[PDB]
Design an enzyme around this catalytic site. Structure first.
Site, PDB file in Angstrom:
ATOM      1  N   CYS A  53      -4.837   1.134   7.862  1.00 41.84           N
ATOM      2  CA  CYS A  53      -4.881   1.669   6.406  1.00 41.84           C
ATOM      3  C   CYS A  53      -5.674   2.526   6.048  1.00 41.84           C
ATOM      4  O   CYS A  53      -6.884   2.346   6.126  1.00 41.84           O
ATOM      5  CB  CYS A  53      -4.928   0.297   5.500  1.00 41.84           C
ATOM      6  SG  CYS A  53      -4.532   0.794   3.718  1.00 41.84           S
TER       7      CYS A  53
ATOM      8  N   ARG B  20       3.698   2.424   6.096  1.00 41.09           N
ATOM      9  CA  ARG B  20       4.812   3.301   7.122  1.00 41.09           C
ATOM     10  C   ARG B  20       6.184   2.533   6.844  1.00 41.09           C
ATOM     11  O   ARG B  20       7.063   3.292   6.295  1.00 41.09           O
ATOM     12  CB  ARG B  20       4.528   3.329   8.287  1.00 41.09           C
ATOM     13  CG  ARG B  20       3.116   3.984   8.691  1.00 41.09           C
ATOM     14  CD  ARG B  20       3.460   5.469   9.024  1.00 41.09           C
ATOM     15  NE  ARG B  20       2.431   6.210   8.799  1.00 41.09           N
ATOM     16  CZ  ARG B  20       1.561   6.704   9.710  1.00 41.09           C
ATOM     17  NH1 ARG B  20       1.935   6.278  11.039  1.00 41.09           N
ATOM     18  NH2 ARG B  20       0.499   7.381   9.692  1.00 41.09           N
TER      19      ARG B  20
ATOM     20  N   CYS C  77       0.637  -1.224   0.068  1.00 41.03           N
ATOM     21  CA  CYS C  77      -0.173   0.121   0.163  1.00 41.03           C
ATOM     22  C   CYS C  77       0.638   1.282  -0.024  1.00 41.03           C
ATOM     23  O   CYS C  77       1.832   1.373   0.587  1.00 41.03           O
ATOM     24  CB  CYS C  77      -1.047   0.125   1.267  1.00 41.03           C
ATOM     25  SG  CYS C  77      -1.920   1.361   1.277  1.00 41.03           S
TER      26      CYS C  77
ATOM     27  N   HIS D  74      -1.733  -3.904   5.451  1.00 40.57           N
ATOM     28  CA  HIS D  74      -1.263  -3.376   6.869  1.00 40.57           C
ATOM     29  C   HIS D  74      -2.382  -2.651   7.628  1.00 40.57           C
ATOM     30  O   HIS D  74      -3.547  -2.227   7.155  1.00 40.57           O
ATOM     31  CB  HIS D  74      -0.228  -2.489   6.794  1.00 40.57           C
ATOM     32  CG  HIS D  74      -0.293  -1.180   6.236  1.00 40.57           C
ATOM     33  ND1 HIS D  74      -0.672   0.118   7.102  1.00 40.57           N
ATOM     34  CD2 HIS D  74      -1.170  -0.587   4.895  1.00 40.57           C
ATOM     35  CE1 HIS D  74      -1.031   1.009   6.079  1.00 40.57           C
ATOM     36  NE2 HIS D  74      -1.395   0.429   4.913  1.00 40.57           N
TER      37      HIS D  74
ATOM     38  N   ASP E  46       0.017   4.161   1.614  1.00 41.04           N
ATOM     39  CA  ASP E  46       0.264   4.724   2.887  1.00 41.04           C
ATOM     40  C   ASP E  46       0.723   3.825   4.018  1.00 41.04           C
ATOM     41  O   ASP E  46       0.589   3.919   5.091  1.00 41.04           O
ATOM     42  CB  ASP E  46      -0.918   5.245   3.346  1.00 41.04           C
ATOM     43  CG  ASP E  46      -2.296   4.105   3.688  1.00 41.04           C
ATOM     44  OD1 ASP E  46      -3.355   4.475   2.925  1.00 41.04           O
ATOM     45  OD2 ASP E  46      -1.899   3.052   4.277  1.00 41.04           O
TER      46      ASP E  46
END
Ligand SMILES: [Zn+2]
Ligand SMILES: [Zn+2]
Ligand SMILES: [Zn+2]
Ligand SMILES: [Zn+2]
Lengths: 208, 208, 213, 212
Positions: free
Chosen positions: A89, A34, A30, A86, A32
């Site tokens: 999200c 981290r 993804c 994750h 976003d």
């Protein structure tokens, strides 16, 4: 803008500090997310071929992701494709919110379709747990979509070794957790997908 | 499956070692770039919202990338979008090679269109330097494409603060190198694009 | 080659006939989203005046959430041309529906048709309650209902509705043996009327006539 | 709303008439890629038997390298239906060309039309030599030439040719005032004939009559 200058500063300091001192996986994650894949997996840069999009989707007719997949499989001869989602999200939360966010909403409609597909399950789940569950189901569904691509089916049909994986990392412990869909053939796709959904659909006693 | 097992071991050991010890940028980079943006930029984790595709393209009609961009600009209110290329890009090399690689060749045709657009320049350059120059030209072109999107044009039209940057990461020194296209408006886009191409067209005495 | 030469001869003959023996309708009033099979043309089906149709055709008349091509046709039609009616039209004996249901790897097209296979799965219980030689046509009808639903969930259509713009969505199928357009039930002038009519339409289609069981 | 009710009455009237007054052509032999404007319908232009056309329409009749929709139509047509002729048909007074050329933000469709603007700039020198009121119809023609070129560079078409499959690409434009299909000069049965014909078509379009 000072944040661009700060970025140049940090890059310079990093590169300088460092000097003072054949990819084997396609990783689909993804935008976003981290922690970078290479950090999560303690691999050397170059070991992963990486695609990142909002909510780590393999949409059937997304030329972008499918191109990455076909290149990885047919040209790089990569033997392992990993879809990693994750927790917390933003993509998933965005998909669940009832706001029109504009163009991105169309992208996230595929996630809303997954939500509906598992509406009985998610409807029985207490509302505050629904995001975590969707995040996990999503990963499972995306592996299923990946294994159904003409690209992957052909690779398998001609005897090419290729495995598909779908994990989620929890930002709260950094452990990769297998969601249970693991395919090395169409049969193993079908069985492990069904298996995985059945397992994901057993709710803890926080039901209805 | 040992490579997968190894990955779970590394992840477990990593997360254990680690415990015992608002994104501000949209980062559009290449799937086959090796050093991750987060490392290279040495920023706080979560500072970057990352899209990765083959040869770090912003294709006019790519739903995937345009969605990331719209989401970043309209919803996340990110003020900086950075396109980052890198040297020894397999995507660029693939684009320039005369092989049919399958579906990916369609993706890379946009790159070949860029090569033709700058064909006079590239033709005056020694063959072994052309991949290097195309990679740089590609970043400038992608920033241009980004600045031409309805999303960016509109963001600027309504007075939203938004800057576009085009850099190339140099693997040999780890430094980000600005290619000179930096846009905060349609007018600065036109000028800095024209300026950037003009600068990139000054070839070292390695002509023809 | 002969097919092409004959095409130019057909064209030259028709055009020249026209001369020695459309412009007033500059802006179409309907968007017709339909299948590339183009069995009975929209013009023949509708007998609209020349120029009144804005047309998009793709394999099995899909409105895929993230299809830039179709979404572009829709957005232009609605925001630029100010069209007030969008019609999705399917047809029986659809090669796309048949391909979607077949197990064969036909290559790239299979990916496009995975969306129809998802729909097939989504209504697997119902379709399993039907006689085998009735399933393709039921899937054709269900496909049209689902595509109207997809169309009505686009950011494009919802935004048009939210700002008070008049816009209706329609989903029809014709039998290629008789050309009669039949309404599949999903008709939306708003997000609420979309929800209700989509739900009602699937419920209606789930009430099987005993011929089809 | 009345427009729709009327449409059903027209349809019933036509279909009923037909009954009390296509199946033999189940596989089309031509792929027609054309504009959503659909001014003079393909069937009218060509006078083909019913069912012979496989049709894709989009705004300004584009074959975009990475458009899954058009590329899917093409691959199904070539690899599955074994169609041997693909025709790209443009038309004068094209709203998509006009929108492409205008500076207005029309929203999402602007992104689709950025590809036409790329072509406009690719041939910017040529187009600047034309009288303003002739530019749109010149861009329509160049557009068609460029889309045939794109079609012939697709992996789908190149692979077909590579494996020895018979396939020709055509690019025509008709004037909405008269319906005569005019060949724009790019006609490919091979990668080599694609290149030569594409270059020849652009060269010929670059030789201007009167209208400067
Ligand atoms: Zn995420
Ligand atoms: Zn690269
Ligand atoms: Zn059909
Ligand atoms: Zn047109």
């Amino acid at each position: 803008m000072d944040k661009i200058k700060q970025l140049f500063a940090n890059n310079y300091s990093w590169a300088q500090r460092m000097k003072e001192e054949t990819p084997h996986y396609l990783w689909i994650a993804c935008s976003d997310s981290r922690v970078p894949a290479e950090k999560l997996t303690n691999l050397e840069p170059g070991e992963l071929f990486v695609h990142r999009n909002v909510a780590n989707q393999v949409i059937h007719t997304d030329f972008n992701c499918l191109s990455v997949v076909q290149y990885a499989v047919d040209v790089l001869k990569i033997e392992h494709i990993i879809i990693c989602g994750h927790t917390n999200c933003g993509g998933i939360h965005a998909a669940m919110a009832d706001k029109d966010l504009g163009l991105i909403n169309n992208w996230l409609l595929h996630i809303r379709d997954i939500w509906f597909k598992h509406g009985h399950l998610l409807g029985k789940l207490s509302p505050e747990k629904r995001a975590d569950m969707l995040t996990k189901i999503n990963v499972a569904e995306q592996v299923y979509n990946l294994g159904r691509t003409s690209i992957v089916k052909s690779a398998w049909e001609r005897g090419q070794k290729l495995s598909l994986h779908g994990w989620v990392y929890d930002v709260n412990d950094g452990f990769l957790v297998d969601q249970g869909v693991m395919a090395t053939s169409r049969e193993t796709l079908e069985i492990s997908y069904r298996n995985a959904i059945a397992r994901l659909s057993i709710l803890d006693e926080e039901n209805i």
